Amino acid sequence: GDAAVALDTVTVVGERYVDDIVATLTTLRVGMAVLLQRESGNQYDDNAISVWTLQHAKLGYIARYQNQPYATLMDQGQRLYGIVTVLDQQKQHLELMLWRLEH
Amino acid sequence: GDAAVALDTVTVVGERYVDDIVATLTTLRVGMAVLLQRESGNQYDDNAISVWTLQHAKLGYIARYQNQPYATLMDQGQRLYGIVTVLDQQKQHLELMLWRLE
């Protein structure tokens, strides 16, 4: 059919640098899916992967110490996304369980 | 404009992701001046500020955690630039003291 394979969990950092960050963390609830975007052109990290809401509001980035693996998979054409696993909204925390989509 | 005021020190990052970086870092020495370029249109960070050598060769960017203070000033019209204070070719590490020309 369509199939989804579970990968692993990651943390989303850089919230403080996200503008509407406060209101956007509102358009998201635990157990909700989020979109992933590869940014090989990111001047700070060529392995960068920003995270976004289904409404397309930036949430941050996949922690640098968890970048490499998924960055390589996405470059191979794999379709990746995440599901909000932990929120801790007042600390602007955010963890996800990444999945691969097989069409 | 015949006067310059010292601001604070900043770290230039992303060197490794810059083309010709090794060749370019060869043209630099401590005590040399570098140019700054505001890039508010950056898709990843609107406080983005790239750093270039006097011959306009890319070096990298001012750390994200040291962006804001300067990004704002530059957006207010102030002319800023830097001076190389620390240099480590092997580690492609670069630090500058920023100056406001006026």
| Residue A14: CATH number of its domain | 3.30.70.2330
In the block, tokens 């102030």 appear at B78
- Which residues make Cβ contacts (< 8 Å) with residue B93, sequence separation at least 6? B11, B15, B86, B87
A17 CB within 8 Å of a chain B CB: yes
Min Cα–Cα distance to chain B from A50, Å: 9
Asked if A95 contacts A10 with a C-beta cutoff of 8 angstroms, the reply is yes
Count of structural domains, chain A: 1
B66 CB within 8 Å of a chain A CB: no
Dihedral (Cα; B47, B51, A40, A61), 10-degree rounding: -40
Which are the residues after which chain B is interrupted (C to N > 2.5 Å)? none
Q: Experimentally, how was this structure solved?
A: X-ray
- Percent of chain A as helix, strand, coil, to the nearest 5: 20, 40, 40
Task: Give resolution, Å, one decimal.
Answer: 2.4
Asked if B60 contacts B26 with a C-beta cutoff of 8 angstroms, the reply is no
For A97, phi then psi, to 5°, come to -110, 115
In angstroms, the CA A90 to CA B86 distance is 38
Burial A3-25 (b: 16+ CB within 10 A, else e): eeeebeebbbbbbebbeebeebb
| Domain, as residue range, for B38 | 1-102
